[model samples]
Target: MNTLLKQLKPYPFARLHEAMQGISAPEGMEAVPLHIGEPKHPTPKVITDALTASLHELEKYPLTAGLPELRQACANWLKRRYDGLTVDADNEILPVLGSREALFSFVQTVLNPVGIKPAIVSPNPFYQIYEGATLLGGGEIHFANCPAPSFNPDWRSISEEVWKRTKLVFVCSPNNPSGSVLDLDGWKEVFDLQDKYGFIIASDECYSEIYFDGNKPLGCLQAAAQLGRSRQKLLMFTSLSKRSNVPGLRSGFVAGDAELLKNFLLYRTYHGSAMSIPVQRASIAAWDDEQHVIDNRRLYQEKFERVIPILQQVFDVKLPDASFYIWLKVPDGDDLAFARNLWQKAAIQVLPGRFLARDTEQGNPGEGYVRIALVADVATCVKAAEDIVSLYR
Candidate 1:
């Protein structure tokens, strides 16, 4: 086994499982798990049909770069989503099994172990993959704790020494657990840092479509286009799973920095984690269809509107600008205790904010927060919110 494997921390789900161990839910109430961000909605028929139609193609080996048609579909979707941005379908885009695998594998391709002290920067209370990728790649993890202006990483605060050692910086817009979206200034700041430090920028936009407000989330490519920084140093990864309600499909694409993608594709070829033909076909259909995404967003929006007010009565709850999570600040600072108590008393399962984040040089920004995923139906989410309010009342 690789020695780097020991550096990895327990995944959020694993911690959630340990927290819930031996704890029984209320006798009459059903357990409502709002911990994981898995979409509970029904998968679209278009995806299923495409998968079935492409079943015969399974006989052939899937190329690591994905099929041309699939890449073209991804490029088209990129153009549609990021109005002014243009992506090179052949060179810039590489379809992966999912964003998770691509994110992990891309680190291997980008990190140079020969450096004096290679480092990777990511948001402190971040998606675990960023830290895992950095650590396993033999790079020091420099966590930019959530800054005050936006709950995104504070790249400006990073010391010049850390910046020089940094090889990759992972930025999650409409951030997981926090639901904070990066604006134009934020993008510029990160890109400017990238220019200075010569580190790869990996923008994770999986939760881009799940927004409560009418405003669409700003993307890295869109910001890059506006700033005239059309270079390939920045890569953006997006998935149809969250946007189209098809997690099992394991389909997503990474676009940006043609040269960086070229190396990533070569790394993936040896990793042998190519997207299956059926998944590629399904992804094409999912990426092409905007109506289903709109519907999915609408469902999550309704759930948030109904649930936020109820949760606010007990905890400090605000409707997240984007993403389906409700990042609530608990009354006391003990997030783990709050989560465990909520599960045992109210039969509601929420992930502790501490589990989602790590303590940085400043402190743990997520220490007093709890992340509630509104992946259930509107009624169920509302009920869970009411139960939480009732518990506190």
Candidate 2:
């Protein structure tokens, strides 16, 4: 086994399992699991039909760069969303199995040693992949904690030395647990830092489309173009899984920094990470359609509208800028204890925020919160919120 494997922390869900150790599956009451973010909705049929239609082509080997049509579809979507930002479909886009796979390997593809030790900077209470990927790539981790409600990475908190040596900076907009977004001003600050340090920015936009607004959620590419730099050191990854309810499909694209993507394509060729023909076909359909995506957002919006009012009565909950999570402060600032209590009392399962964050010198930013996923139907989430409120009452 690779020595780097030891550096990986217990995944949040694995520790979540451990946290629920004493609680048995609830009796008499229906158990509600708002901890996981997987959508319960069905995958759109247009995407499925595309997959089935292309099954005949699956017999042939897949290209690591994905099909031309799929890349074109992705490019068109980018243009539509990013205010006419032109993506060179042939070079700027590389469709991957999913954003997760691309994100992990992209670190491996980049992250050359800078200073004595390479460092990767990211938000503290972040998606687990960013930390694990950096560790496996032999880079030191620098976490900037995001204070609640705002969920902005405290970029000021990072030492000048760490920033100087940083090779990569990972950012999640409409962040995973907290669901806060970095606006244009935030991008301006980051772009300034990137200009000074010359570090690559990997913008994870997996939750980009689950927003409740029209033409909101500024993308990294969009920001880059607006600033007159067309993705020089920035790469953005987006998935159809949450947007179109197709997690099992494992389809998404990484677009930006043609130079960087050229190297990533080389790395992937050796890694044998290629999308199947059927998946590429399905992804094309997914990337092309917007009606299904709009409907999907409506569903998430409905859940948030109904559930937030209920959860606010108990947890210090607020509506997310985007994404389906309801990150809330638990009573007494004890996330693990709160999660266990919710499970035992209300038959509700939520993830302890601590499990999702690392203990830095500054302390764990996720310590006092519990992340509730409103990925279920509106009624189910409302019920979970009511159950949570009952505990506080």
Candidate 3:
């Protein structure tokens, strides 16, 4: 077995299970799970119908570059979603099995291990893949601790020494747990830093489409285009999972610099990471249609509207800028204790923030907080909120 796997920590869900150990919920009440971000919304029939239509193509082998129509569909969606972004379908965009898979592999493709020690700069309380990918690629992890009202990275904290060795940076807009989206100003800072240090940025925008506010989250390529700079060192990834409620489909696309994507495509060919014909067909259906996405956003909007008020009545909860999660600060700093109390007494399950973050010299930035994913229906979320209030309030 590759010993690099040992460097990776247990996944957040696995750690969460350990935290919930020996604390069985009340016997009678049905458990309300808001720990995982899996969408419970119905998968639209438009996509399912498309999937059925293309089942005959399964006999053919899938190419890593994907079908031309699927690539074009992704490019068209990008143009529609972003105000005035243009990406070449053939060279700049490639169909990925999912954003998660692409994110992990893209790191392997970008890191040049032959020279000086490499580092991957990422947000502190982030999606685990960023860190795991870095570790497996023989790079050190540097964290930009996100604090305060913006929940944005305080990039000034990183020293010139760290930046000198940095090979890549991970930016998650409408971020995991915090739901903080990066504006153009944020992207500008990143561009300036990348220009100085010459690091590639893997922008994770999977939660881009599920915002509570009327303003759409600005994408990486969108931000790059707004600045009139080519997508030089940036790779933007978005998936149909949160956008269209189809995680099981494992469908998404990666777009950015043609040179970087060409290398990534080369890496992917040997890894056997091709999107199946049916999955690509279903992805085309999902990406081509905007009505389903609009309706999907509406459902998430309704959940936030109904549930946040209930949660706020007892906890220090706030509406996220975009994504479905509510990054809440618990009454006390003991997140484990709070989670245990809710689980044992009220049958409510939410993820502890410490699990998502690493302990640093500045302390774990996520220590006092808990991530509440409002991926459940309005009524179910309300019940979880009510249970939390009944116990802790």
Whose TM-score is greatest here?
A: 3
Tens-digit lDDT string for candidate 1 (1-393): 669898899999898898889988789988888888789999989889999998998898888888899999988988888784678898989998889888988897777687387998888788888988888888888888884335867766689988888888888888987889988888888887877778888889999888866788998888888888876688889888899888877888888888888777777888998888888888889999998888888898888878877777777667777998888888888889888898889888888988888886688888888888988888888888887888787
TM-scores of the models, in the order given = 0.95, 0.96, 0.97
- Show the lowest summed lDDT stretch of 10 residues, model 3: 108-117
Predicted candidate 2 versus true structure: per-residue lDDT over 1-393, tens digit per residue:
769898888888899988787687568977788889688888899999998988999789998998899899999998897778899999999998888899999898776664488999989898888999999888998898998658888899898999988999988997998888888888999999999999999999988888885747888888877777757888998898888999999989999889999989999999989999989988988889999998998898888888878766756667788888988888799988888888888888899998888898889999999888888888888888887788787
Could you arrange the candidates by lDDT from highest to lowest?
3, 2, 1
Predictions: Cα RMSD each = 1.6, 1.6, 1.3
Candidate 2: C-alpha lDDT: 0.87
Estimate candidate 3's alpha-carbon lDDT, on a 0 to 1 scale: 0.88
Model 2 bad stretches (over 4 Å): 112-115
| lDDT tens per residue, model 3, 135-163 | 99888898999886898987887899999
TM-score of 3: 0.97
Error of 2 at 174 (Å): 1.6
Query: What is the Cα-based lDDT of residue 275 in candidate 2?
Result: 94
lDDT winner among the candidates?
Answer: 3
Each model's lDDT:
0.85, 0.87, 0.88
Q: Model 1 clash tally? A: 1
